[PDB]
Amino acid sequence: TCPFYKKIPGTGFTVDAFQYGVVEGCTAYFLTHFHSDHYAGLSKHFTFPVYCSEITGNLLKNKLHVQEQYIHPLPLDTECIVNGVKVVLLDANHCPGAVMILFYLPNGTVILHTGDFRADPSMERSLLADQKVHMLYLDTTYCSPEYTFPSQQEVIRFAINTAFEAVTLNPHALVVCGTYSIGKEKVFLAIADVLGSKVGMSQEKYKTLQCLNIPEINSLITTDMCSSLVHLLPMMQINFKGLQSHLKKCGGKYNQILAFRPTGWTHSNKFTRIADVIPQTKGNISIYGIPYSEHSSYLEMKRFVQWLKPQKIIPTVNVGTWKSRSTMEKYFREWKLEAGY
């Protein structure tokens, strides 16, 4: 059964609620982004209307084979009417095609559902600036002050410099990057660009990337592994055994692997600045864990919420424990008392 924080009161609408069978009274199903915890339950057999971005809709059609007649893509930053209710999709600064959704309820209530997001000051100059929001359904993934990590730009700078240095010192090194979902494409694309290589990958991953409207993509990716010195592999293979095994397959073209595991936050962020990060090494294989986040840091989330001044906040992440729920409620009250709304 569908939980309360996936329902939009005063509408026939749900958000990210595909794993509960037919939801009672739901006339339209919104999908914020193509990540499996959110799309869970969609397939070619789904026969209700799905509302989403253009990119999410390309993925629904080509990866899950949802039939075209039930896909309703909407443009961003554009007031649209859906079953009698005005909605707007805004860029969530998450993975490709990820949106936040503003709902203008018939009774005058305004609701913002962030989906998954990485709050940024640029959002303070979207269509959010124009009006009041009564209820915020907030991605609270990292809602605790211990969650600090660098900007995406700093992390990419570290990665490009690291890869460029290693391959310039050794022209026979291979760079490997781990993946398990869409998002974080900048990591592997930036590395390939500085090295003048295309990124090589499986047919299934190439297919996924072809759905994402990235400019000049035919120029950056390939299924021909032998022509590439940046390879993508599944995240589970990014360990000394899986990499030793991959190196065997490259037929004596390479004698070293430098690999990257983009993670979210890890506890080493408590102690170690991005500049100071070092790999785990065994023989001719080095592995860097880099904190490339597509969710708000605590400080980024706090700044967004204190700007927005919502009347009520409903968390959508870490909602399963009393300890988490209590912690999050205490922060929302601090924020409110500090800023005065």
Ligand code: NI
């Ligand atoms: Ni996500």
